């Protein structure tokens, strides 16, 4: 079994107060408490980041909804916080109790996703770099749960933030998912005692750091023997009816009296009128997914742009997800850039999640796409 | 750790080499610095490759 | 068992190209392919038209989603395409594979309803005759599936189309259902070699033809031994709360301060104020289903008209559906105008569907209504 530390809810209405007198004399934030009970986590399905599934585990002590569960491992993870600076960090799996049944089986939600809950973010914040969004999302003054610090690899979140659809107000969950897909990284919450020996506080931090500051791409093979589960995910939201029966309203009748114009999307990506086609069908799709679209003529009176129709019939990012057993010959840990060979086909992406169960040790591989 | 094995008990741990690896093999190797703690130096000549 | 021809998806992005060199010299559309595999359909529920239920069958060869299944019968169906002209049409049951499970049991959808999928049709096209709507719906330049031609009876679709609700944009499925209910007909898809001996192509045609050009009404009896499933369907949409508690806003208060006026719909259909009633209850409904309606006074200030309230409190077309076993003493087939006697009551309508199973042969009888 694994060891588990059970604490009461890390209420930021209590812990965010900077009244604690440090040994030197300085006034700082309130440190994390001691576990109300030391128990042992048993009959477990424990994820590392909580990318797809929520963790579930039975616990010896009678835990209740709200309590924080810190699962301990007798091993250490070295995170590169600065180019040369590597810090000794202890392996932890921190969750929030969402629901306990009659048989004391607790439904555990990964601390980070349970922290950025109900938080909404406007398009104005998303206009800047990915660092600005992370600095907004991780704040104990706003979040439902207490936060002390954030470790983040500057190179991975250096790039310009992904463009938002309709420039609307999105939830912290949807933006994080959209950002974490492009950066090819996943967050891990860790409880560890303050770095300075003078500070006696136990603190909770969020991890956006890796074993290598400048991440390198790995090349590996996944055999059918590892109980492989193949399923297709969609990163970007784009429409599914590749053929469009487009109708344009007549100005004189203020009605759709005029016949429709059919538009087909080629295999390359371009959108053409169906009547204009002069080919052999090799450059057109294998299956015709169709929809009927209605458009209103602009103030100028001109028909709607080809490009505007194109966006609605354009293809979505078909991405392959692979869930398999941990290979001891070539171990794959979370937040690693990999190139997986499966049944003669090459899939490129990252390790998003990791399940620590009683029977097996499994990985969630997410193909980042961007192949041609 | 820096455990005093000569005077007291315990297990002494000390890093000497830093091996950076890839998926297949080794990429780069950097050895740990050899610290020479001294009180007073009476030297004639010196050549420095880094800084004082 | 039954014989089955399995073809890959009839992609109109490929087959709707007039590059096929005919023996005479001229260019025509690409003909249908040869079946990729000849298999035998076992453990089946096969619907002739697909009026109410979707077909299901376990096939010997491992078919996949998208593939077209042509079920063969060693019998011939004569459809009358012209007043005197009849064509020797071989019996066929054409379907599109929608989903296959682990045990290779394929969910089959009737070719026509799968072809007119996702197609939307505004009030503008419905304004004309039934021929114009059929000519729009059956077109390989728009449809998800390939179609070469259609044979139909001029008399049955000769009449003026049904008036649309709210004059909105309706789907191809909803309009076809509304049209097929009034015309008392159902479509059948069939694969047949081109009529001319010169043309060597194999083609797919949608059928809107019958054994008799000028359809005759038959009067028969259906016994309890034929295992009848009696249920009710509604052709026309009309409101279900037969009593109306109508409120009218007061001009001076700009509020609903004034008391409500109750309106009751009589058995004949006449809508009167409840206060104005002077009868014995015999001309009123046996059950009172009530509803409360709110109205805003017009620009003139006058209360809303009686006829306008009537529409919101009108009865819907109660139609009886009888699913029964085939009687060998008097056989009934798809698209036959019939008058059925069941348990002492006479019901009039048409044979909408036919289910071919390994054990029995059944028919769906749909009453057209319009009795008083």
Q: Which descriptor suits the 3D outline of chain A?
A: elongated
* Alpha-beta content class of chain B: mainly beta
> Counting H and I runs of at least 4 residues, what is the number of helices of chain A?
5
Q: Structural class of the helix and strand makeup of chain A? A: mainly beta
The biggest chain-chain interface is: A-C, 25 and 22 residues
Strand tally of chain A, please? 23
Oligomeric form: part of a larger assembly
Describe the largest sheet of chain B: 2 strands, antiparallel
Helix fraction bin of chain B:
under 10%
Distance between the termini of chain A: 46 Å
Q: Got a strand count of chain B? A: 2
Strand proportion of chain A: 35-45%
Portion of residues within helices of chain A: under 10%
Strand order of the largest sheet of chain B: 1-2
Main β-sheet of chain A, in a few words? 6 strands, antiparallel, barrel
PDB class: viral protein
Keywords: viral protein, siphoviridae, lactococcus lactis
Entry title: Structure of the Phage P2 Baseplate in its Activated Conformation with Ca
Chains A, C: ORF16
List keywords for this structure.
3 chains; A: 372 residues; mainly beta; six-stranded antiparallel beta barrel; four-stranded mixed β-sheet; B: 52 residues; 0% helix; viral protein; siphoviridae; lactococcus lactis
Structural features, described:
- It is classed as viral protein.
- Keywords: viral protein, siphoviridae, lactococcus lactis.
- Structure of the Phage P2 Baseplate in its Activated Conformation with Ca.
- Chains A, C are ORF16.
- The structure is cut from a larger assembly and holds two copies of chain A (372 residues) and one copy of chain B (52 residues).
- With 372 residues, chain A is mainly beta.
- In chain A, 9% of the residues lie in helices and 39% in strands.
- Chain A has helices at residues 12-15, 123-126, 130-137, 172-182, 306-313, and strands at 2-7, 20-21, 27-28, 37-46, 55-59, 68-80, 86-100, 105-110, 120-121, 149-152, 170-171, 188-193, 202-208, 218-221, 229-234, 243-248, 261-265, 271-273, 290-295, 318-325, 337-342, 345-357, 361-367.
- In chain A, the strands form five sheets. Chain A has a six-stranded antiparallel beta barrel. In chain A, strands 18-17-16-19 form a four-stranded mixed β-sheet, covered by helices on one side.
- The two termini of chain A are 46 Å apart.
- With 52 residues, chain B is mainly β.
- Chain B has no helices and two strands.
- Chain B has a two-stranded antiparallel ribbon.
- In chain B, strand 1 (17-21) and strand 2 form a beta hairpin.
- Chain B is flat, with a radius of gyration of 18 Å.
- Classes of the chains: A mainly beta (372), B mainly beta (52).
- Chains in contact: A-B, A-C.
- The A-C interface holds A 241, 243, 245, 247, 255-257, 260, 262, 264, 274-275, 279-281, 284-292, 294 and C 9, 11-15, 17, 19, 66, 117-122, 124, 141-145, 169.
């Amino acid at each position: 079994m694994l060891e588990a530390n059970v604490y009461d809810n890390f209420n930021p209405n209590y812990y965010n107060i900077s009244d604690f007198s440090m040994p030197n004399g300085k006034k700082e934030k309130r440190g994390l408490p001691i576990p109300k009970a030391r128990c042992q986590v048993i009959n477990y399905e424990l994820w590392e980041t909580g990318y797809l599934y929520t963790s579930s585990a039975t616990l010896t002590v009678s835990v209740e909804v709200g309590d924080i569960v810190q699962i301990l491992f007798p091993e250490v993870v070295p995170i590169e916080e600065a180019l040369g600076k590597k810090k000794k960090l202890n392996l932890d799996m921190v969750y929030l109790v969402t629901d306990v049944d009659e048989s004391n089986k607790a439904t555990l939600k990964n601390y980070f996703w349970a922290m950025i809950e109900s938080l909404d973010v406007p398009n104005a914040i998303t206009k800047t770099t990915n660092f600005a969004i992370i600095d907004y999302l991780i704040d104990p003054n706003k979040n439902n749960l207490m936060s002390y610090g954030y470790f983040f690899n500057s190179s991975i979140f250096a790039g310009k933030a992904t463009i938002n659809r309709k420039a609307e107000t999105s939830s912290a969950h949807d933006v994080a998912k959209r950002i974490f897909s492009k950066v090819q990284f996943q967050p891990t919450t860790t409880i560890q005692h303050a770095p300075s020996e003078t500070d006696p506080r136990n603190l909770l931090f969020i991890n956006f750091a890796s074993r290598n500051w400048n991440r390198k791409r790995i090349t590996t093979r996944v055999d059918i023997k590892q109980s492989v589960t193949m399923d297709t995910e969609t990163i970007v939201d784009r429409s599914a009816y590749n053929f469009a029966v487009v109708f344009v309203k007549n100005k004189a009748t203020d009605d759709y009296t005029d016949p429709p114009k059919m538009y087909i999307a080629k295999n390359n990506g371009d959108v053409i009128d169906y009547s204009t086609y002069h080919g052999d069908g090799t450059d057109l799709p294998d299956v015709r997914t169709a929809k009927t679209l209605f458009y209103d003529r602009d103030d100028h009176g001109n028909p709607p742009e080809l490009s505007t129709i194109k966006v609605e019939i354009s293809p979505s990012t078909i991405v392959t997800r692979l869930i398999f057993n941990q290979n001891e010959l070539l171990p794959l840990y979370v937040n690693d850039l990999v190139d997986i060979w499966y049944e003669g086909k090459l899939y490129s992406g990252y390790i998003a999640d990791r399940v620590k169960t009683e029977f097996n040790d499994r990985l969630i591989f997410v193909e980042s796409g961007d192949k041609p | 750790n820096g455990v005093d094995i000569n005077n007291g008990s315990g297990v002494l741990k000390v890093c000497f080499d830093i091996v950076t690896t890839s998926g297949t093999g080794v990429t780069s190797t950097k050895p740990i610095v050899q610290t020479s703690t001294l009180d007073s130096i009476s030297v004639n000549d010196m050549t420095v490759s880094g800084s004082i």
